[PDB]
């Protein structure tokens, strides 16, 4: 399938 | 290891994909996440994750917790090469030590803390 990119949220 | 992803994609295909992704995103690590066998815990809709190197294992725990819709009370444990990685380690350190020959990092998850 496709890749799930992750983005950390800022505090 | 006992991962379904390795039984649906041959090694040559996985290694080629892993080498390109590590070139396209040198600040990210490709991670394959699957449920450990005999585990009693919810499933994961997607198993391929591109994770920033500076994300900690504790932050990935929480991210995975939400995708499974686990409560904060419910247990969740990661296993890399049959060892539970420390929550204070980053995904970059974990990848650098444990990445397999296809340039993927493999993580199993379970409700149990004992290998398993």
Author numbering:
A (entry chain B): 33 to 43
B (entry chain A): 1 to 116
Source paper text:
The nonstructural small (NSs) protein is the primary virulence factor of RVFV that suppresses the host’s antiviral innate immune response. Interestingly, these searches identified four putative LIR motifs that are located between residues 4–7 (4FPVI7), 59–62 (59FYNV62), 238–241 (238WIPV241) and 261–264 (261FVEV264) in the NSs sequence. In humans, the six LC3-family proteins (LC3A, LC3B, LC3C, GABARAP, GABARAPL1 and GABARAPL2) are key autophagy factors that function by regulating growth of autophagic membranes, recognition of autophagic cargoes, and fusion of autophagic membranes with lysosomes. LC3 proteins carry out their various functions during autophagy in part due to their ability to interact with other autophagy factors that contain LIR motifs.
Based on a structural model of the full-length NSs determined using AlphaFold, the first two putative LIRs (from here on referred to as NSs1 and NSs2, respectively) are located within a structured domain at the N-terminal end of the protein, whereas the third and fourth putative LIRs (from here on referred to as NSs3 and NSs4, respectively) are located within an intrinsically disordered region at the C-terminal end of the protein. Given the results with NSs4, additional peptides containing the NSs1, NSs2 and NSs3 LIRs were purified and their KD’s for binding to GABARAP and LC3A determined using ITC studies under identical experiment conditions as used with NSs4. Likewise, no heat of binding was observed between NSs3 and LC3A again suggesting a KD value for binding of this complex is >100 μM. In contrast, the KD value for the binding of NSs3 to GABARAP was determined to be 16 ± 3.0 μM. In contrast, we obtained co-crystals of a complex between NSs3 and GABARAP that diffracted to 1.9Å resolution. In the co-crystal structure of the NSs3-GABARAP complex, the aromatic ring of W238 of NSs3 forms hydrophobic interactions with the side chains of Y5 (6.3Å), I21 (3.7Å), P30 (4.5Å), I32 (5.5Å), L50 (4.7Å) and F104 (3.3Å) as well as anion-π and cation-π interaction with E17 (3.8Å) and K48 (4.4Å) in HP1 of GABARAP. In HP2, the side chain of V241 from NSs3 forms hydrophobic contacts with Y49 (3.9Å), V51 (3.8Å), P52 (3.3Å), L55 (4.5Å), F60 (4.6Å) and L63 (3.5Å) of GABARAP. In addition, there are hydrophobic interactions from I239 of NSs3 to K46 (3.6Å) and Y49 (3.9Å) of GABARAP, a hydrogen bond interaction from N236 of NSs3 to K46 (4Å) from GABARAP and a hydrophobic interaction from V242 and the aliphatic portion of the side chain of R28 (3.9Å) from GABARAP. Lastly, the side chains of Pro240, Pro243 and Pro244 of NSs3 form hydrophobic contacts with the side chains of L50 (4.2Å), L55 (4.2Å) and Q59 (3.9Å) of GABARAP, respectively. In total, the binding interface of the NSs3-GABARAP complex involves residues Y5, E17, I21, R28, P30, I32, K46, K48, Y49, L50, V51, P52, L55, Q59, F60, L63 and F104 of GABARP and residues N236, I239, P240, V241, P243, P244 of NSs3.
